[PDB]
Design a protein around this nucleic acid. Structure first.
Lengths: 142, 223, 129, 83, 164
RNA sequence: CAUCCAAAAUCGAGUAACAAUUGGAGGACAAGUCUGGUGCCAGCACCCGCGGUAAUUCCAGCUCCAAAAGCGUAUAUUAAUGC
RNA sequence: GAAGAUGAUUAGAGACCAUUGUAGUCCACACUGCAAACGAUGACACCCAUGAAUUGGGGA
């Protein structure tokens, strides 16, 4: 339980300081190993250079093929996978094009039917990829 | 409805003008065994009937399975009468019809006090109360005027029924099983009169039951 | 052992009241326990009480009229103040109408209602409905 | 008796009955809280008519404290004789 | 740098915006009183919650407290103005019986119509913004101007008006 | 910004082309018993789940819904949490 | 009686079973402190009702 004494204070304090290390919602904030691990440095986005297009399978209950992109990160020289999140826009990504990369949804667990991938490609060459998809802009090769 | 024959003492009296209100029945504790006792005394244009839930239940059987439908009714007057049915029938309309019967049996009155400001007629519960069914337990806290009904939509209904317009609430445990939440909330609003307060006591006098007084006319009733 | 005299007394009263019993025994006695009882007997929640003398420590005996619903103890004797009467009165009591918190002051032992009136806060003692 | 307004006007649907034994409020919900009515008697064995009343709570038939309390209530009113 | 001017929000969106209960009681207002969008319904809500907070806090206090005395008279005074409450009110429980419509009702848009100077609320919103209304002698082209109990009886028309 | 289209003398809307968008409509969560196309493919899906030719969820059209000159998306943080 | 050996059982079998057999099982003096070391119920203190027995002391 707990201590109700007048001078009990210090025991209470030290108890909390111990038991917050059993919380993962404390660690995720205060500890900088988490920051380091994250490929953006904990920044909102980052840019990368497209390496290779990689076809990626899917898990057992929903059989599909998914289009993914092996990208390298300018900032930290790490490699990462990301998903193309529109229909038939694999075309609009080509090798050695700069590209932006974002997280998607829950960022501690991988998204369903794509293992290991929490990362979706928002922008190709700073153009909105959505804009290309539902036609407004056209991709520069300029 | 179809023509009705009382098999209850109360029922006879209610069909006559002898018992003219719920209060008489409540005040000298007696069970309501016929829903027709409610409809006669409390006229329609005060009563409301909502269905809080309808859900399938399944019972296991070898090969194919039989099915059923649970449902809840809720009932009452905004003048401080509430009552919650729940029943089971093998079809939709069955369980619906059944619920509304049970509901009108289970009717109980409601005490509403004040928060420590007295104007008009009661807008607030008289005290904190709790009710519990399953691991959920609700804590009704009295609120100042103009607070509104601060609860989730599920109890918001149940509170609107009972004439409570100002409350603050919280729940505990598993609240995402609907059925348990309803019964819980209702047992809360009972517990009001179940708690002794200084304002009530004075050694208030008792008198004869309506049944007893009217015994002669119930004898004649039997004939 | 017992580290609060009040706690030993008012868990006999509460239990007894929930069983509807019309008298209760209280194992110790203090100057403090007296004053607490006195309050509630004025406001009408207790018939009478006797203090009996063994010439070591007394044994209080009380007559319950069944008009109580709880008698608690606020054990650490936390500090309440002129603004903070409000706080306590809401949080530990079911009402503001008939909730009675009892406090200690230099002046004596009294209800929150009388405490406000004389404009002195103090350390809390116990409570009853 | 009961809740009032600042205008002194009763707001209650009803004022519940007293159980004389424990001085607790008999609920509508309790249906084991029975009202026992004994008819008084005078000299020459003539009934005065039903006059006195007891009310017992439904928490006194869950362990049968009922009998006990009825005696203390009765004996005090001179209804039941003790030597 | 060196800006010492305040910013504050006057409106906020209630939690859980997909409640079909709330939606009913929104459209009912915004259509009837001719309001532009839901933003307006919320704007009044905020200011009402604010008022009701201090009134609750005052009500808690024992009699003859400075907070109670001073600031009690003020809250009451400004609901006498604008005609939200009448001069038979004093309790600071009356103040807590105020709700969203009684505010909206005293906006210029509705007051114009109700006094007989337009044929609809929609039509009275135009009459305002085409600079052809006044509120005593002062041309007001804002529909959300709250009109004093005194000065809803001197509305007239603008002196720039071809309708006046 | 405001005040004005003469004080003798100074402009101008009718598809009011001076034309509102961004996300949604199986559940959670306000809104489709739709029509065409695709057929475990293409893709959607925070989560539960949709697609194997009978798709209320995909790709199009119409219809309706929420907010509105603002609306989606990402990450962090706070409330939600008596986790 | 773990290990080992031999005979069965079995498709396969130091298997489970049978005949054997070392460490160990015992004692003294040292270590080890690892158990479902369980009542899966921490320690001290107060209040709390129904019936029939048992184990120690004391009382008539």
């Amino acid at each position: 339980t707990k201590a109700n004494g007048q001078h009990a204070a210090r025991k209470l304090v030290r108890l909390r300081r111990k038991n917050r290390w059993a919380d993962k919602g404390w660690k995720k904030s205060h500890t900088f190993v988490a920051q380091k691990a994250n490929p953006f440095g904990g920044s909102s986005h980052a840019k990368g250079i497209v390496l290779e297009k990689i076809g990626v399978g899917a898990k057992q209950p929903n059989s599909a093929i998914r289009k993914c992109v092996r990208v390298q990160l300018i900032k930290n020289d790490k490699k990462i996978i990301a998903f193309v999140p529109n229909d038939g826009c694999l075309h609009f990504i080509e090798e050695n094009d700069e590209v932006l990369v974002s997280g998607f949804g829950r960022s501690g667990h991988a998204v369903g039917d794509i293992p290991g991938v929490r990362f979706k490609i928002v922008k190709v060459s700073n153009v909105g990829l959505y804009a290309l998809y539902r036609q407004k802009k056209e991709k520069p090769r300029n | 409805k179809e023509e009705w024959v009382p098999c209850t003492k109360l029922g006879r009296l209610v069909k006559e003008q002898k018992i003219t209100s719920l209060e008489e029945i409540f005040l000298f504790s007696m069970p309501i065994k016929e829903h027709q006792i409610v409809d006669q005394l409390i006229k329609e244009s005060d009563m409301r009937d909502e269905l809080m839930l309808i859900v399938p239940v399944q019972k296991a059987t070898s090969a194919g399975q039989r099915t059923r439908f649970k449902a809840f009714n809720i009932v009452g007057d905004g003048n401080g009468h509430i009552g919650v049915g729940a029943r089971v029938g093998k079809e939709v309309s069955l369980a619906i019809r059944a619920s509304m019967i049970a509901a009108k049996l289970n009717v109980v009155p409601i005490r509403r006090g004040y928060w420590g400001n007295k104007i008009g007629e009661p807008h607030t519960i008289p005290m904190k109360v709790t009710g519990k069914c399953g691991s959920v337990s609700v804590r009704l806290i009295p609120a100042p005027r103009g607070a509104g009904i601060v609860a989730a939509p599920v109890p918001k209904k149940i509170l609107e029924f009972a004439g409570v317009e100002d409350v603050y609430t919280s729940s505990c445990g598993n609240t995402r099983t609907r059925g348990n939440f309803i019964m819980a909330t209702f047992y809360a609003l009972r517990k009001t009169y179940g708690f002794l307060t200084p304002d009530l006591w004075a050694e208030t006098e008792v008198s004869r039951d309506p049944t007893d007084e009217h015994s002669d006319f119930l004898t004649m009733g039997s004939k | 052992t017992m580290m609060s005299v009040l706690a030993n007394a008012l868990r006999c009263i509460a239990s007894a009241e929930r069983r509807g019993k019309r008298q209760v025994l209280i194992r110790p006695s203090s100057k403090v326990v007296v004053k607490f009882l006195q309050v509630m007997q004025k406001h009408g929640y207790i018939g009478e009480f006797e203090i009996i003398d063994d010439h070591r420590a007394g044994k209080i005996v009380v007559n319950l009229n069944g008009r109580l619903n709880k008698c608690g103890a606020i054990c650490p004797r936390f500090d309440c103040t002129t603004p903070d009467f409000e706080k306590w009165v809401k949080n530990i009591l079911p009402s503001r109408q008939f909730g009675f918190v009892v406090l200690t002051t230099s002046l004596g032992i009294m209800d929150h209602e009388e405490a406000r009136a004389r404009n002195t806060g103090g350390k809390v003692l116990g409570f009853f409905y | 008796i009961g809740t009032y307004n600042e205008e002194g006007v009763n707001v209650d649907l009803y004022i519940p009955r007293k159980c004389h034994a424990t001085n607790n409020l008999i609920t509508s919900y309790d249906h084991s809280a029975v009202q026992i009515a004994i008819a008084n008697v005078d000299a020459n064995g003539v009934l005065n008519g039903t006059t006195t009343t007891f009310c017992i709570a439904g928490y006194l038939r869950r362990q049968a404290e009922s009998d006990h309390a009825i005696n203390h209530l009765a004996i005090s009113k001179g209804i039941i004789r003790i030597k | 740098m060196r800006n010492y001017n305040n910013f504050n929000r006057v409106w906020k969106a209630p939690r859980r915006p997909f409640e079909k209960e709330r939606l009913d009681r929104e459209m009912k207002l915004c259509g009837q009183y001719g309001l532009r969008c839901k933003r307006e319904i919320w704007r009044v809500n905020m200011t009402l919650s604010k008022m009701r907070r201090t009134a609750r806090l005052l009500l808690t206090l024992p009699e003859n407290h400075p907070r109670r005395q001073l600031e009690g008279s003020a809250i009451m005074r400004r609901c006498h103005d604008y005609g939200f409450l009448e001069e038979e009110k004093d309790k600071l429980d009356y103040v807590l019986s105020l709700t969203v419509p009684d505010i909206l009702e005293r906006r210029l848009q509705t007051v114009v119509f109700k006094h007989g100077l337009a044929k609809s609320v929609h039509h009275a919103r135009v009459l305002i913004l085409q600079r052809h209304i006044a509120v005593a002698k002062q041309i007001v082209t804002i529909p959300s101007f709250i009109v004093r109990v005194s000065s809803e009886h001197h509305i007239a028309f603008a002196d720039a008006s071809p309708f006046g």
